[PDB]
Amino acid sequence: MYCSRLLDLVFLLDGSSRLSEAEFEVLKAFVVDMMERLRVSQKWVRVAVVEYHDGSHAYIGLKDRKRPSELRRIASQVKYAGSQVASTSEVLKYTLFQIFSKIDRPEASRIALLLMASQEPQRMSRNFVRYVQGLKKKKVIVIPVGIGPHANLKQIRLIEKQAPENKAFVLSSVDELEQQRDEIVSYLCDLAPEAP
């Protein structure tokens, strides 16, 4: 399993206490494992990593010019937040208005891998669907990955409904990430075009 195509992949990690400190390490390990199966490079697969709570912290930006090994190290060091809330709406907003404020590589496909393990208060979801529709308009594919029993299933189904390629992966716990990893990498790689 190795992806050598034109793709901008954004990893969005749920920073809530729905994942324990140790389960969060397993999530970070999945992110590093995914990076190892992607041709990390500005010319091939660029990557971004954001941990989101009520607000979010970007550890790697798509434009960061660093060796793939240093990017894997940064991912492995993302700090555990353990917040009461991890707003999927705010992080999709951040992705739409900040990460993709401009579309720098129209030759690459763009994917937001939304790793979800919790459910935000309803008031935080007010613009949810508008953020998902805004992403669709800029051709940013949203791939929700539900983890655990507190994952917001309503939001996972709403994302799939907004665009045909927004396929969801619903997992019982972070332990399943390792098992489904190659399958996910494969589905994401196929959404991207080959270099010329």
Epitope: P121, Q122, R123, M124, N127, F128, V129, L158
Partner: antibody, heavy 122, light 108 residues
Framework: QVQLKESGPGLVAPSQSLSITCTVS????????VDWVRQPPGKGLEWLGM???????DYNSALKSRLSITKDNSKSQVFLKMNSLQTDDTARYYC????????????????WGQGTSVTVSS | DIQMTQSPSSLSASLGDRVTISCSAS??????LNWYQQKPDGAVKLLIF???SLHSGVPSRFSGSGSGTDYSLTISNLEPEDIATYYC?????????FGGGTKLEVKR
């Protein structure tokens, strides 16, 4: 039939609080939101805030953090409380239902209570 | 806050007339516009939501249209029970805000 009705105190002395209970029927507060809207005598409508099915809330910041909306799902009641009223808070206060359906971005004020008149004076 | 303007606060008409009430927002509101009716006795009811959908019970003589900043509520044939004040309201962004109202009056 969807219904909402306000029980207010009628009068509030300047600097005191306003408490109003909205009692609803015909739907469950767990599946709908409830908003509060007010109308000063001879003037238009002002949206004040609302409470979602899950109890989370949205408030109009023009109220300067003076407003609280809470509820009791099992008693079909929604409670408005506002700190330190002044004469310009004199108005008729309405509780109004809204679908609070973010999946469909649908928040219309679809069924209104008749309203309760509040006068702030010493 | 987004400002909603109803240019005519008082609109005269004869029963049987086609009446149009206009509303405009200070910025694009993406058709997130609702219309309400307040009768002389104070009762408020929702008439039109999301620019053009009729609420339950509302008769077809009421219709709404528009996009961008400009919206209109049309009453195809004015009936006595329609003498009331009409308000538009936006939900493009919190806090929700209402137009200043348009009160219909009967000509004589």
């Amino acid at each position: 039939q969807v219904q909402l009705k306000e029980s207010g105190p009628g009068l509030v002395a300047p600097s005191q609080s306003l408490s109003i209970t909205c009692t609803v029927s015909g739907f469950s507060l767990t599946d709908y939101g409830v908003d509060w809207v007010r109308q000063p005598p001879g003037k238009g409508l002002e949206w004040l805030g609302m409470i979602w099915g899950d109890g989370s809330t949205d408030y109009n910041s023009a109220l300067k953090s003076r407003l609280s909306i809470t509820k009791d799902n099992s008693k079909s009641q929604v409670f408005l409380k506002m700190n330190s009223l002044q004469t310009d808070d004199t108005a008729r206060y309405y509780c109004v239902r809204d679908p609070a359906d973010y999946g469909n971005y649908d928040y219309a004020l679809d069924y209104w209570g008749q309203g309760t008149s509040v006068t702030v004076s010493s | 806050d987004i400002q909603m303007t109803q240019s005519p606060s008082s609109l005269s008409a004869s029963l049987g007339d086609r009446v149009t009430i206009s509303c405009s927002a200070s910025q694009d509101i993406n058709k997130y516009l609702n219309w309400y009716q307040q009768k002389p006795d104070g009762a408020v009811k929702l008439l039109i939501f999301y620019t053009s959908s009729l609420h339950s019970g509302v008769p077809s003589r009421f219709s709404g249209s528009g996009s961008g900043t400009d919206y209109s509520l049309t009453i195809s044939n004015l009936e006595p029970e329609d003498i009331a004040t009409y308000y538009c309201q936006q939900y493009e962004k919190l806090p929700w805000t209402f137009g200043g109202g348009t009160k219909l009056e009967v000509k004589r």
